[PDB]
């Protein structure tokens, strides 16, 4: 039952562990070729510099990822980029360096259709996790069918990413590829959950005792006990806050403490397998694993409490015993179990820790139920009829009047315009409600990646955003509130746009902004890039469904003042039409605001304009 869930057998685990140990003898990495499998093992390090970067001035050695090199490691709709440990990222950067032949070896294995496996022990396993993401970004994501599913297997690895990191891994359906083995008491997976000020004095000694090749520094009881107590105190604070950061009826005190609490951002990413003498327990839910990292590291009675720090040290070197006795241990998948009492009882988890784990699992199943309900909703006839009516009845009738459905909605002279407004409001309510669920993290990580949702939301945005723009300008909202692009655009459309752009752009490693600015510079405007960015600030040319918004912002202004934005809109129009973002049957109509304004442009522009032959 273990292999059908993790997709790896005991053979691969054993080879990965052997390579991770062999990596101790190299400078950067060791490559082990085992027929169809190529294993890259990274050398671990036990200096405090390699856990908290000296030049990092944050309380947990964290740093935001560069959106250019890891475009997927972010929230799509919200935009917030993921955060990782800076020391681990610098170490990965040092191993990806062309001079190391690491990348050449990766591509040699890729061309050979070998099963690629990334692995490492202790902090080396953390590097392996980041290397896997690099692989996922560079190779697997561009065409995930012919490329072979990789595996990342870590042993006692520190935590690497934050909650956004885990969310992004979940959305891409990548978490299933990661297995992190953690012996019950192992202190190392808990290390980065503590504030760096809490262990600044005791960390070098503990790292010296944990290093298997450093039998020089004499073991000190005091330092290890102080270290364990500091780590457990900060871990307990993080876990209890995570408990509160799920429930409710206390958002005020949580916001005040958020302004005054420094809690570690690092969260479990991927499947975790906890091991005892008699059990192997696999867990997928990151929140549940976070809780288990605390409640599995306590004493059963409190008189053994003086003994626990030494077992928490010794357990970091007990993964060898784990690997040899895998098949002799009882395995269960915690998320799929009908009863979790036995597993958590064997892990020494207290009653309260079990109730927190159960609550985290209940919350994830609630999110799954919400997604099933959303699919049932968006497939019902009463919902789809509104979009069908807008597309097949309102638009053709407005085209027949030779003014278009934007101008017809804007003047709203007929009953059909108020009926369209009613259905626009109902659709707005439904998509705002979905956005609300997303904002509260009450949908599955995969939600923003579901292609059925992206299809529907794109059809909705293309059909109805022109109508919300018309409604906006009908009520004179642009000077009072401000620019639509600046202060008026509903967030639901921004989420829809970003979800679609990510869906279509992520196989090519590029981000929407880069594609946009490359086309803008491709339009041969001649102006300085900084000047154009100044002109195109809050421009409507970043999304085809904001075409009419840009017209509103461009009409009335002198030609010299917004010439660049005009030429930008023209350069985007044909591709937008080809892509279906803008309907060609609408914008050229006799009574269209766009056509009426386009004729009033100077004749020198209209003469050499791409639209001369269309109006």
């Amino acid at each position: 039952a273990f292999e059908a869930l993790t997709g790896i057998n005991g053979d691969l685990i054993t080879r990965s562990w052997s390579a991770s140990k062999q990596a101790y003898l190299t400078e950067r990495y060791h490559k082990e070729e085992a027929g169809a499998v190529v294993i890259f093992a990274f050398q671990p390090s036990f200096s405090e510099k390699d856990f908290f970067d000296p030049d990092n001035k944050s309380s947990f050695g964290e740093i935001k990822l560069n959106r250019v090199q890891f475009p997927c490691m972010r929230k799509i709709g919200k935009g917030d980029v993921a955060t990782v440990n800076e020391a681990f990222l610098k170490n990965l950067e040092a191993v990806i360096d062309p001079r190391t032949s690491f990348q050449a070896s990766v591509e040699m294995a890729v061309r050979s259709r070998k099963q690629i496996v990334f692995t490492g022990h202790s902090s080396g396993g953390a590097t392996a996790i980041l290397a896997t993401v690099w692989y996922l970004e560079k190779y697997f994501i561009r065409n995930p069918n012919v490329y072979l599913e990789p595996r990342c297997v870590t042993f006692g690895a520190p935590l690497v990413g934050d909650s956004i990191f885990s969310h992004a891994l979940g959305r891409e359906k990548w978490s299933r590829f990661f297995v992190n083995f953690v012996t019950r008491f192992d202190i190392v997976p808990r290390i980065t959950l503590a504030r760096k000020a809490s262990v600044e004095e005791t960390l070098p000694h503990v790292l010296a005792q944990l290093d298997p090749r450093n039998s020089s520094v004499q073991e000190s009881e005091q330092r290890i006990t102080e270290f364990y107590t500091s780590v457990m105190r900060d871990t307990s604070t993080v876990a209890n806050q995570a408990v509160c950061e799920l429930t409710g009826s206390a958002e005020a005190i949580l916001e005040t403490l958020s302004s005054f609490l420094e809690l570690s951002p690092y969260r479990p990413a991927g499947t975790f397998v906890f091991s005892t003498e008699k059990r192997l327990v696999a867990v997928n839910n990151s929140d549940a694993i976070l809780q288990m990292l605390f409640y599995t590291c306590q004493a059963s009675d409190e008189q053994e409490w003086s003994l626990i720090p030494f077992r928490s040290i010794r357990d970091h070197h007990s993964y060898e015993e784990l690997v040899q006795s895998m098949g002799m241990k009882l395995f269960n998948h915690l998320d799929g179990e009908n009863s979790i009492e036995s597993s958590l009882n064997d892990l020494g988890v207290s009653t309260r820790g079990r109730q927190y784990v159960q609550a985290a699992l209940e919350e994830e199943k609630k999110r799954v139920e919400n997604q099933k309900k959303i699919i049932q909703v968006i497939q019902q006839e009463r919902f789809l009829k509104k979009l069908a009516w807008i597309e097949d009845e309102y638009k053709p009738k407005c085209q027949a009047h030779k003014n278009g459905y934007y101008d017809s909605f804007k003047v709203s002279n007929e009953e059909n315009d108020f009926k369209a407004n009613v259905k626009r409001a109902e659709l707005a309510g439904v998509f705002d409600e979905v956005l609300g669920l997303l904002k509260k993290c009450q949908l599955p990580d995969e939600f923003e990646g579901d292609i059925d949702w992206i299809k529907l939301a794109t059809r909705y945005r293309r059909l109805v955003e022109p109508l919300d723009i018309a409604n906006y300008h009908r009520h004179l909202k642009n000077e009072d509130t401000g620019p639509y692009m600046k202060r008026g655009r509903p967030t639901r459309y921004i989420y829809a746009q970003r979800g679609y752009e990510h869906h279509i752009l992520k196989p090519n490693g590029m981000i929407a902004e880069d594609v946009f600015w490359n086309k803008v510079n491709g339009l041969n405007l001649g102006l300085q890039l900084e000047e154009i960015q100044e002109t195109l600030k809050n421009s409507g040319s970043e999304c085809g469904s904001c075409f009419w918004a840009e017209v509103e912002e461009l009409k009335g202004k002198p030609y010299e003042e917004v010439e660049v934005r005009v030429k930008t809109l023209e350069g985007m129009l044909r591709e937008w039409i080809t892509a279906g973002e803008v309907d060609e049957k609408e914008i050229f109509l006799e009574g269209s605001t766009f056509r009426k304004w386009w004729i009033t442009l100077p004749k020198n522009h209209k003469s050499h304009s791409p639209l001369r032959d269309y109006m």
Partner: nanobody
Amino acid sequence: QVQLQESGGGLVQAGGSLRLSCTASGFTFDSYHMGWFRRAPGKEREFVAAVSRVTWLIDIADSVKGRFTISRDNAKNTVYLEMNSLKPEDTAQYFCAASQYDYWGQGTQVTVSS
């Protein structure tokens, strides 16, 4: 830089006892098990007996089982193998491998007279 150290070999008659030591100085002391193998010119380098430097549990191959014994000491990072009631077939060069072998040292001779 990193190497192994062996000591203990010699020559005993039948039904004797011999203790072999294995200094594990260098790199990675406890994350490995350690296991004695023996190679006799004319016989393959079969397995003798291994044990973990975290788990006292001793695995002993059947060819030498019941007569050999292992012991562990992480302080001096050393695995000891004591054997008794030896028989003429125990003549070989013994290597204390890293169970997932780390490297291959020099080993020690062990000879038993009839």
